[PDB]
Short mmCIF file of C-alpha atoms in Angstrom, two decimals:
data_model
loop_
_atom_site.label_atom_id
_atom_site.label_comp_id
_atom_site.label_asym_id
_atom_site.label_seq_id
_atom_site.Cartn_x
_atom_site.Cartn_y
_atom_site.Cartn_z
CA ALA A 1 -49.97 20.95 19.59
CA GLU A 2 -49.61 22.86 22.89
CA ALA A 3 -53.13 24.05 23.72
CA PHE A 4 -54.73 24.45 27.16
CA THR A 5 -54.63 21.71 29.78
CA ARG A 6 -56.68 21.48 33.00
CA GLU A 7 -54.07 23.48 34.97
CA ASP A 8 -54.75 26.43 32.65
CA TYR A 9 -58.50 26.42 33.42
CA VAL A 10 -57.78 26.29 37.15
CA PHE A 11 -55.53 29.33 36.57
CA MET A 12 -58.37 31.40 35.06
CA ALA A 13 -60.54 30.44 38.05
CA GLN A 14 -57.79 31.82 40.30
CA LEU A 15 -57.20 34.85 38.08
CA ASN A 16 -60.96 35.49 38.05
CA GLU A 17 -60.92 35.25 41.86
CA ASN A 18 -58.00 37.67 42.19
CA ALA A 19 -59.79 40.16 39.94
CA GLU A 20 -62.91 39.65 42.11
CA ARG A 21 -64.94 38.86 38.96
CA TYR A 22 -66.90 35.97 40.37
CA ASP A 23 -69.48 35.68 37.60
CA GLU A 24 -66.59 34.70 35.35
CA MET A 25 -65.24 32.44 38.11
CA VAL A 26 -68.55 30.53 38.13
CA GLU A 27 -68.30 30.06 34.35
CA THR A 28 -64.66 28.92 34.45
CA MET A 29 -65.54 26.44 37.20
CA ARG A 30 -68.58 25.32 35.17
CA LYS A 31 -66.14 24.53 32.31
CA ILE A 32 -64.06 22.36 34.67
CA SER A 33 -67.23 20.64 35.93
CA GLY A 34 -68.13 19.69 32.37
CA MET A 35 -64.74 17.99 32.10
CA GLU A 36 -64.23 14.32 32.88
CA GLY A 37 -62.86 13.28 36.29
CA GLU A 38 -63.51 14.35 39.86
CA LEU A 39 -62.76 17.83 41.18
CA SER A 40 -59.57 18.07 43.24
CA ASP A 41 -59.61 19.54 46.75
CA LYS A 42 -58.29 22.78 45.23
CA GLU A 43 -61.02 22.71 42.56
CA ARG A 44 -63.80 21.98 45.08
CA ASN A 45 -62.81 25.08 47.07
CA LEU A 46 -62.66 27.26 43.95
CA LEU A 47 -66.20 26.04 43.18
CA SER A 48 -67.42 26.88 46.68
CA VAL A 49 -65.73 30.31 46.63
CA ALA A 50 -67.13 31.32 43.22
CA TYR A 51 -70.75 30.43 43.99
CA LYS A 52 -70.48 31.95 47.50
CA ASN A 53 -69.35 35.31 46.05
CA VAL A 54 -72.17 35.32 43.48
CA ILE A 55 -75.01 34.35 45.87
CA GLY A 56 -73.47 36.36 48.73
CA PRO A 57 -74.09 39.92 47.40
CA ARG A 58 -77.68 38.98 46.48
CA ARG A 59 -78.57 37.76 49.97
CA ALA A 60 -77.12 41.03 51.29
CA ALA A 61 -79.18 43.04 48.81
CA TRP A 62 -82.22 40.93 49.64
CA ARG A 63 -81.86 41.60 53.37
CA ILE A 64 -81.49 45.37 52.78
CA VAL A 65 -84.53 45.64 50.48
CA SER A 66 -86.60 43.35 52.73
CA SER A 67 -85.81 45.53 55.75
CA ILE A 68 -86.66 48.74 53.85
CA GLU A 69 -89.94 47.12 52.77
CA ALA A 70 -90.77 46.12 56.35
CA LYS A 71 -90.28 49.75 57.40
CA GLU A 72 -92.47 51.15 54.59
CA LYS A 73 -95.30 48.71 55.36
CA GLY A 74 -95.20 49.46 59.09
CA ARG A 75 -95.77 53.18 58.51
CA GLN A 76 -98.52 55.25 60.10
CA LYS A 77 -99.55 56.41 56.61
CA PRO A 78 -98.26 53.69 54.24
CA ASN A 79 -97.50 54.41 50.58
CA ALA A 80 -98.92 51.40 48.70
CA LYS A 81 -97.07 52.39 45.49
CA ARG A 82 -93.60 52.70 47.04
CA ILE A 83 -94.29 49.46 48.90
CA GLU A 84 -94.97 47.83 45.51
CA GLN A 85 -91.89 49.42 43.97
CA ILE A 86 -89.79 47.78 46.69
CA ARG A 87 -91.67 44.47 46.72
CA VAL A 88 -91.13 44.11 42.93
CA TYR A 89 -87.41 44.85 43.41
CA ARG A 90 -87.16 42.17 46.10
CA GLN A 91 -88.93 39.70 43.80
CA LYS A 92 -86.32 40.44 41.13
CA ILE A 93 -83.50 39.67 43.57
CA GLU A 94 -85.39 36.53 44.64
CA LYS A 95 -85.38 35.40 40.99
CA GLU A 96 -81.59 35.82 40.82
CA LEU A 97 -81.19 33.84 44.05
CA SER A 98 -83.25 30.88 42.82
CA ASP A 99 -81.48 30.98 39.44
CA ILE A 100 -78.06 30.76 41.13
CA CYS A 101 -79.22 28.20 43.72
CA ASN A 102 -81.02 26.11 41.11
CA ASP A 103 -77.91 26.20 38.94
CA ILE A 104 -75.47 24.75 41.49
CA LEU A 105 -78.02 22.30 42.93
CA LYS A 106 -78.34 20.86 39.38
CA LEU A 107 -74.57 20.42 39.04
CA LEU A 108 -74.36 18.78 42.48
CA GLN A 109 -77.26 16.40 41.80
CA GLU A 110 -76.48 15.54 38.16
CA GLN A 111 -72.68 15.83 38.02
CA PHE A 112 -70.66 16.08 41.22
CA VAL A 113 -72.35 13.65 43.67
CA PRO A 114 -72.99 10.87 41.08
CA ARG A 115 -69.37 11.06 39.81
CA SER A 116 -67.86 11.22 43.33
CA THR A 117 -65.91 8.23 44.70
CA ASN A 118 -64.28 9.67 47.88
CA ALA A 119 -65.79 9.94 51.36
CA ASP A 120 -64.69 13.51 52.13
CA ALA A 121 -65.85 14.67 48.67
CA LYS A 122 -69.33 13.21 49.19
CA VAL A 123 -69.66 15.10 52.51
CA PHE A 124 -68.55 18.34 50.86
CA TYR A 125 -71.09 18.11 48.02
CA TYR A 126 -73.93 16.99 50.29
CA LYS A 127 -73.11 19.89 52.61
CA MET A 128 -73.08 22.29 49.65
CA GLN A 129 -76.42 20.91 48.44
CA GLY A 130 -77.90 21.47 51.91
CA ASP A 131 -76.54 25.02 52.09
CA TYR A 132 -78.01 26.21 48.78
CA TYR A 133 -81.33 24.60 49.70
CA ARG A 134 -81.14 26.57 52.97
CA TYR A 135 -80.60 29.75 50.93
CA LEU A 136 -83.75 29.03 48.90
CA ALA A 137 -85.56 28.33 52.19
CA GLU A 138 -84.46 31.74 53.59
CA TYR A 139 -86.93 33.70 51.41
CA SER A 140 -89.56 31.01 50.69
CA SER A 141 -92.85 30.24 52.46
CA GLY A 142 -95.67 27.68 52.69
CA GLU A 143 -95.38 24.43 50.74
CA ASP A 144 -92.34 25.84 48.93
CA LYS A 145 -90.34 26.31 52.15
CA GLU A 146 -91.50 22.94 53.54
CA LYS A 147 -90.48 21.12 50.35
CA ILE A 148 -87.17 23.06 50.23
CA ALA A 149 -86.43 22.49 53.92
CA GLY A 150 -87.08 18.76 53.42
CA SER A 151 -84.45 18.46 50.70
CA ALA A 152 -82.07 20.63 52.76
CA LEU A 153 -82.58 18.21 55.68
CA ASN A 154 -81.84 15.20 53.43
CA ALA A 155 -78.70 16.71 51.94
CA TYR A 156 -77.39 17.58 55.42
CA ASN A 157 -78.24 14.13 56.85
CA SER A 158 -76.48 12.41 53.94
CA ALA A 159 -73.55 14.72 54.59
CA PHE A 160 -73.79 13.95 58.31
CA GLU A 161 -73.98 10.16 57.91
CA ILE A 162 -70.84 10.01 55.75
CA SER A 163 -69.01 12.64 57.85
CA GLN A 164 -68.74 10.03 60.62
CA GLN A 165 -65.86 8.45 58.66
CA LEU A 166 -63.76 11.63 58.65
CA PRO A 167 -61.87 12.69 61.81
CA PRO A 168 -63.79 14.89 64.33
CA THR A 169 -61.30 17.74 63.71
CA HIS A 170 -61.81 17.70 59.91
CA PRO A 171 -62.84 21.14 58.56
CA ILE A 172 -65.61 19.72 56.34
CA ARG A 173 -67.07 17.68 59.22
CA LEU A 174 -66.98 20.65 61.60
CA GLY A 175 -68.24 22.86 58.75
CA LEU A 176 -71.25 20.58 58.29
CA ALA A 177 -71.91 20.59 62.03
CA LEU A 178 -71.93 24.40 62.08
CA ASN A 179 -74.31 24.85 59.13
CA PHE A 180 -76.60 21.92 59.95
CA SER A 181 -76.98 23.40 63.45
CA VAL A 182 -77.76 26.83 62.00
CA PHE A 183 -80.23 25.08 59.67
CA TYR A 184 -82.07 23.60 62.66
CA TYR A 185 -82.20 26.90 64.58
CA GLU A 186 -82.93 29.36 61.75
CA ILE A 187 -85.08 27.29 59.32
CA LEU A 188 -86.55 24.12 60.91
CA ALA A 189 -87.35 25.89 64.21
CA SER A 190 -85.57 23.21 66.27
CA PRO A 191 -83.34 24.80 68.97
CA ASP A 192 -82.67 21.58 70.91
CA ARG A 193 -81.39 19.73 67.85
CA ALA A 194 -79.36 22.79 66.85
CA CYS A 195 -77.86 23.16 70.34
CA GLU A 196 -77.12 19.44 70.72
CA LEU A 197 -75.53 18.86 67.29
CA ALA A 198 -73.29 21.91 67.78
CA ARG A 199 -72.41 20.70 71.30
CA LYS A 200 -71.51 17.13 70.26
CA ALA A 201 -69.46 18.21 67.23
CA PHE A 202 -67.67 20.80 69.38
CA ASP A 203 -66.96 18.25 72.13
CA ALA A 204 -65.63 15.64 69.67
CA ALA A 205 -63.27 18.34 68.33
CA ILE A 206 -62.21 19.26 71.89
CA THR A 207 -61.14 15.61 72.47
CA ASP A 208 -58.69 15.67 69.54
CA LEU A 209 -57.61 19.29 70.32
CA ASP A 210 -54.12 17.86 70.97
CA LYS A 211 -53.92 16.98 67.25
CA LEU A 212 -54.48 20.62 66.17
CA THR A 213 -51.89 21.85 68.70
CA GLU A 214 -48.09 21.72 68.50
CA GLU A 215 -46.34 19.69 71.20
CA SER A 216 -45.14 23.08 72.49
CA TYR A 217 -48.63 23.83 73.90
CA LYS A 218 -49.96 20.30 74.58
CA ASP A 219 -50.26 21.01 78.34
CA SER A 220 -52.45 24.11 77.78
CA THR A 221 -54.55 21.99 75.40
CA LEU A 222 -54.91 19.45 78.24
CA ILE A 223 -56.16 21.87 80.93
CA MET A 224 -58.67 23.16 78.35
CA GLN A 225 -59.89 19.58 77.86
CA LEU A 226 -60.03 19.11 81.64
CA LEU A 227 -61.97 22.36 82.07
CA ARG A 228 -64.46 21.09 79.49
CA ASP A 229 -64.54 17.73 81.32
CA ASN A 230 -65.45 19.22 84.64
CA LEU A 231 -67.95 21.49 82.97
CA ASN A 232 -69.67 18.58 81.36
CA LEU A 233 -69.66 16.60 84.56
CA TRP A 234 -71.25 19.35 86.51
CA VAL A 235 -74.56 19.62 84.87
CA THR A 236 -74.69 16.14 86.31
CA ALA B 1 -101.90 51.59 39.60
CA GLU B 2 -100.31 54.92 38.52
CA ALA B 3 -97.32 55.75 36.32
CA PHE B 4 -93.89 56.12 37.93
CA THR B 5 -92.74 59.73 38.30
CA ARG B 6 -89.30 61.35 38.51
CA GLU B 7 -89.56 61.24 42.31
CA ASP B 8 -90.25 57.47 42.20
CA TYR B 9 -87.21 56.92 39.96
CA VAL B 10 -84.91 58.83 42.36
CA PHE B 11 -86.12 56.50 45.12
CA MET B 12 -85.20 53.46 42.98
CA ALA B 13 -81.82 55.07 42.28
CA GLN B 14 -81.36 55.24 46.04
CA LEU B 15 -82.61 51.67 46.59
CA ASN B 16 -80.17 50.52 43.93
CA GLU B 17 -77.40 52.27 45.90
CA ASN B 18 -78.46 50.73 49.22
CA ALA B 19 -78.42 47.26 47.66
CA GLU B 20 -74.96 48.05 46.21
CA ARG B 21 -76.42 47.17 42.77
CA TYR B 22 -74.80 49.84 40.62
CA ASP B 23 -75.68 48.50 37.16
CA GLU B 24 -79.36 48.98 37.98
CA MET B 25 -78.44 52.36 39.47
CA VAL B 26 -76.78 53.51 36.23
CA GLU B 27 -79.92 52.43 34.35
CA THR B 28 -82.51 54.17 36.54
CA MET B 29 -80.22 57.23 36.52
CA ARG B 30 -80.11 57.06 32.72
CA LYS B 31 -83.92 56.97 32.84
CA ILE B 32 -84.01 60.21 34.88
CA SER B 33 -81.53 61.81 32.45
CA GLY B 34 -84.12 61.36 29.69
CA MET B 35 -86.87 63.03 31.72
CA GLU B 36 -87.55 66.79 31.64
CA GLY B 37 -84.99 69.48 32.45
CA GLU B 38 -81.59 69.35 34.13
CA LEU B 39 -80.41 67.05 36.94
CA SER B 40 -80.63 68.41 40.49
CA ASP B 41 -77.56 68.41 42.74
CA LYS B 42 -78.96 65.35 44.54
CA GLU B 43 -79.37 63.63 41.16
CA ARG B 44 -75.90 64.63 39.91
CA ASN B 45 -74.44 62.82 42.95
CA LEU B 46 -76.51 59.73 42.24
CA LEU B 47 -75.28 59.88 38.63
CA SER B 48 -71.67 60.22 39.84
CA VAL B 49 -72.01 57.53 42.51
CA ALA B 50 -73.51 55.09 39.98
CA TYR B 51 -70.86 55.40 37.25
CA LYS B 52 -67.97 55.45 39.78
CA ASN B 53 -69.00 52.11 41.30
CA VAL B 54 -69.37 50.52 37.87
CA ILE B 55 -66.04 51.78 36.50
CA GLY B 56 -64.26 51.40 39.86
CA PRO B 57 -64.33 47.58 40.04
CA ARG B 58 -62.99 47.36 36.45
CA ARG B 59 -60.09 49.67 37.26
CA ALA B 60 -59.32 47.61 40.37
CA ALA B 61 -59.32 44.43 38.28
CA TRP B 62 -57.29 46.07 35.51
CA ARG B 63 -54.60 47.04 37.99
CA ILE B 64 -54.54 43.56 39.60
CA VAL B 65 -54.38 41.73 36.26
CA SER B 66 -51.73 44.15 34.91
CA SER B 67 -49.72 43.47 38.06
CA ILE B 68 -50.06 39.69 37.59
CA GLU B 69 -49.01 40.14 33.95
CA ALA B 70 -45.92 42.04 35.09
CA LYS B 71 -44.90 39.24 37.48
CA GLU B 72 -45.49 36.43 34.96
CA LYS B 73 -43.39 38.20 32.30
CA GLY B 74 -40.45 38.88 34.64
CA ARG B 75 -40.13 35.25 35.76
CA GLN B 76 -37.12 32.98 35.48
CA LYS B 77 -39.35 30.51 33.59
CA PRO B 78 -42.16 32.60 31.98
CA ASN B 79 -45.34 30.70 31.10
CA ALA B 80 -46.24 31.56 27.48
CA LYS B 81 -49.60 29.82 27.97
CA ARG B 82 -50.51 32.17 30.86
CA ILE B 83 -49.25 35.43 29.37
CA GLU B 84 -51.67 34.93 26.46
CA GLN B 85 -54.42 34.07 28.94
CA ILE B 86 -53.68 37.17 31.04
CA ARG B 87 -53.37 39.49 28.02
CA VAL B 88 -56.75 38.48 26.54
CA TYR B 89 -58.29 38.90 30.01
CA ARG B 90 -56.84 42.38 30.49
CA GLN B 91 -58.16 43.34 27.05
CA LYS B 92 -61.65 42.12 27.95
CA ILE B 93 -61.57 44.40 31.00
CA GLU B 94 -60.24 47.23 28.81
CA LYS B 95 -63.26 46.83 26.50
CA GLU B 96 -65.61 47.07 29.49
CA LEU B 97 -63.73 50.15 30.68
CA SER B 98 -64.16 51.72 27.22
CA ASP B 99 -67.89 50.98 26.98
CA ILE B 100 -68.60 52.49 30.41
CA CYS B 101 -66.49 55.56 29.62
CA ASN B 102 -68.13 56.13 26.22
CA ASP B 103 -71.62 55.66 27.62
CA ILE B 104 -71.14 58.49 30.13
CA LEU B 105 -68.91 60.72 27.97
CA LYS B 106 -71.58 60.47 25.26
CA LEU B 107 -74.26 61.43 27.79
CA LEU B 108 -72.14 64.35 29.05
CA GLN B 109 -71.34 65.74 25.59
CA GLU B 110 -74.83 65.27 24.09
CA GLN B 111 -77.14 65.84 27.06
CA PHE B 112 -75.76 67.21 30.33
CA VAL B 113 -73.24 69.89 29.28
CA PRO B 114 -75.46 71.21 26.43
CA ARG B 115 -78.58 71.49 28.64
CA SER B 116 -76.56 72.91 31.56
CA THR B 117 -77.69 76.38 32.70
CA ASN B 118 -75.87 76.78 36.05
CA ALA B 119 -72.17 77.39 36.71
CA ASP B 120 -72.34 74.83 39.51
CA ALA B 121 -73.52 72.15 37.06
CA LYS B 122 -71.17 73.11 34.19
CA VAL B 123 -68.10 72.53 36.39
CA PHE B 124 -69.44 69.19 37.64
CA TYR B 125 -70.10 67.86 34.13
CA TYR B 126 -66.83 69.18 32.67
CA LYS B 127 -64.94 67.69 35.62
CA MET B 128 -66.74 64.41 34.92
CA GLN B 129 -65.67 64.41 31.24
CA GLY B 130 -62.10 65.02 32.36
CA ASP B 131 -62.37 62.11 34.80
CA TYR B 132 -63.83 59.54 32.39
CA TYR B 133 -61.45 60.69 29.64
CA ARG B 134 -58.64 60.28 32.17
CA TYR B 135 -59.81 56.71 32.86
CA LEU B 136 -59.51 55.93 29.14
CA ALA B 137 -56.05 57.56 29.11
CA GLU B 138 -55.15 55.29 32.06
CA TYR B 139 -54.74 52.17 29.93
CA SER B 140 -54.54 53.66 26.46
CA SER B 141 -51.32 53.22 24.58
CA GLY B 142 -49.06 55.61 22.74
CA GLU B 143 -50.46 57.73 19.95
CA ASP B 144 -54.05 56.90 20.77
CA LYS B 145 -53.67 58.09 24.35
CA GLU B 146 -52.45 61.50 23.32
CA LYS B 147 -55.71 62.21 21.60
CA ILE B 148 -57.56 61.19 24.75
CA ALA B 149 -55.34 63.17 27.05
CA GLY B 150 -56.14 66.20 24.96
CA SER B 151 -59.88 65.68 25.48
CA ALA B 152 -59.26 65.31 29.23
CA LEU B 153 -57.07 68.43 29.36
CA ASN B 154 -59.77 70.35 27.45
CA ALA B 155 -62.66 69.25 29.68
CA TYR B 156 -60.59 69.92 32.80
CA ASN B 157 -59.55 73.42 31.61
CA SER B 158 -63.20 74.16 30.81
CA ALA B 159 -64.10 72.95 34.30
CA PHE B 160 -61.23 75.02 35.76
CA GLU B 161 -62.44 78.23 34.04
CA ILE B 162 -66.05 78.18 35.28
CA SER B 163 -64.79 76.88 38.65
CA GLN B 164 -63.32 80.34 39.40
CA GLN B 165 -66.89 81.59 39.92
CA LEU B 166 -67.39 79.14 42.81
CA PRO B 167 -66.02 79.78 46.36
CA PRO B 168 -62.57 78.29 47.13
CA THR B 169 -64.19 75.90 49.66
CA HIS B 170 -66.83 74.63 47.19
CA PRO B 171 -66.61 70.81 46.92
CA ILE B 172 -66.83 70.86 43.10
CA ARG B 173 -63.93 73.31 42.84
CA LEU B 174 -61.71 71.48 45.35
CA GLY B 175 -62.81 68.22 43.70
CA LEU B 176 -61.75 69.49 40.28
CA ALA B 177 -58.40 70.70 41.60
CA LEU B 178 -57.73 67.28 43.13
CA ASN B 179 -58.50 65.36 39.94
CA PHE B 180 -56.90 67.84 37.54
CA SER B 181 -53.71 67.71 39.64
CA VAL B 182 -53.84 63.90 39.53
CA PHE B 183 -54.40 64.09 35.76
CA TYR B 184 -51.23 66.17 35.32
CA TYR B 185 -49.16 63.91 37.58
CA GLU B 186 -50.40 60.48 36.47
CA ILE B 187 -51.36 61.00 32.79
CA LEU B 188 -49.37 64.01 31.51
CA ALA B 189 -46.28 63.16 33.63
CA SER B 190 -46.13 66.75 34.96
CA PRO B 191 -45.27 66.80 38.71
CA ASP B 192 -44.45 70.52 38.50
CA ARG B 193 -47.97 71.55 37.37
CA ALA B 194 -49.60 68.84 39.51
CA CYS B 195 -48.12 70.25 42.73
CA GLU B 196 -48.76 73.90 41.79
CA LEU B 197 -52.41 73.18 41.05
CA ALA B 198 -52.98 71.10 44.21
CA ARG B 199 -51.01 73.55 46.37
CA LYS B 200 -52.92 76.62 45.15
CA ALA B 201 -56.30 74.89 45.54
CA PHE B 202 -55.37 73.75 49.04
CA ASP B 203 -54.10 77.17 50.21
CA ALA B 204 -57.12 79.18 48.99
CA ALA B 205 -59.22 76.70 51.02
CA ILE B 206 -57.15 77.17 54.19
CA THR B 207 -57.68 80.94 53.80
CA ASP B 208 -61.46 80.36 53.98
CA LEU B 209 -61.22 77.56 56.59
CA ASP B 210 -63.07 79.87 59.03
CA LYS B 211 -66.15 79.51 56.78
CA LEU B 212 -66.13 75.68 56.99
CA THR B 213 -65.36 75.78 60.73
CA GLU B 214 -67.94 75.95 63.53
CA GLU B 215 -68.15 78.92 65.90
CA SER B 216 -66.74 76.79 68.75
CA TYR B 217 -63.53 75.91 66.85
CA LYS B 218 -62.50 79.23 65.22
CA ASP B 219 -59.38 79.77 67.35
CA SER B 220 -57.99 76.39 66.19
CA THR B 221 -58.65 77.30 62.55
CA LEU B 222 -56.71 80.55 63.05
CA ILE B 223 -53.65 78.87 64.56
CA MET B 224 -53.78 76.41 61.62
CA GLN B 225 -53.83 79.31 59.15
CA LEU B 226 -50.92 81.03 60.95
CA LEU B 227 -48.98 77.75 60.90
CA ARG B 228 -49.61 77.57 57.14
CA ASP B 229 -48.53 81.20 56.70
CA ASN B 230 -45.31 80.67 58.68
CA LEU B 231 -44.50 77.45 56.79
CA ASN B 232 -44.77 79.22 53.41
CA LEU B 233 -42.52 82.11 54.47
CA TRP B 234 -40.06 79.66 56.10
CA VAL B 235 -39.96 77.17 53.21
CA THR B 236 -38.72 80.20 51.29
CA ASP B 237 -35.04 80.60 52.44
#
């Protein structure tokens, strides 16, 4: 008559986190995603954290094995067998990346975004979708990377359209701006768009800087704004 | 394409380590353990590195969860729902700890220590048994632990015996001393013997510190030895 409630599943997610056992954290959060309702702001962050700490170590391992492979291929007297040994290892890690990415992209598409009713929640999920597409795009090529990049672009634009409603100083809105910019520069090969989106988001945040500051420092905040004002103006 | 060879598998072991993927390291190192002969010093490190970084995370988690259990129990308003949750979770980690320990202790007792021909290697493998027995003793309870502590104490004493053949500055010897001393202190609750064993190990090493020291820094080693000597004679009185 006194079994587990939702609070108790959130607790395991936190306990998992504390123990740094993120595979289990992903499963505990998956349980909560299967439940009815919308994820709280606490629960959305636990989701993000879990999946970040599962995909994170793989991207690190991928980058290390990729770099080692680059070195072995660029040799004066290359060893085709060792090169293959590495290449096959990378491919294994690439399979784990796409599994993890695929997994969360499913949940976002089929569960989270369809069941979402809030504005800030929509932006969070659309941002997340765009991120994990960007991670797929980081080791893809050809029609795969084009198709992946296209979906990443959509997710981010959806995120970006709705993010207009939230205040310029909102973490999720700034967070989108940061990643979407990095998406333009590092994937889509678009430095202008990257530079400009980062600039505009940053400037919007600089306008409301007084809202992030205590009244104790509001005059320092103002000179900073004025410095930015003059800087913009020059460049006239 | 050609068959992988021992030298290929040592490279994978090392790739595994670079990627910080220690499950795959423990596997490719198990694969080398099955191949001909005895493990080289390089390979014994890889073996050690692999099992340490698999067990290590579990011990970290076990300590964190045990700490959280402690807090939750000593609350003004303890949460019976959580304490059951935490307990079961600790126990899951304890199982994982036990599987990892058995895996390697089994390997040591059936493969490495039997096929060991060197003194160097014998100490390393006996030390290892002591260590992984100690890790079982770390969370084991009551009567069961005592049996484990005995196995640890045995393996460590065996290590300690053959260790006397190795120089006082030899890493395996100093390594054994460190862990045996920790075993006394933390498992056997024997601070007396812990300090004696660590102190002796440490002093025999300071005596030979000239051998670890470069030619350019010998005068500093000597003043350090004389400082040690004076401290021992002064602490007396």
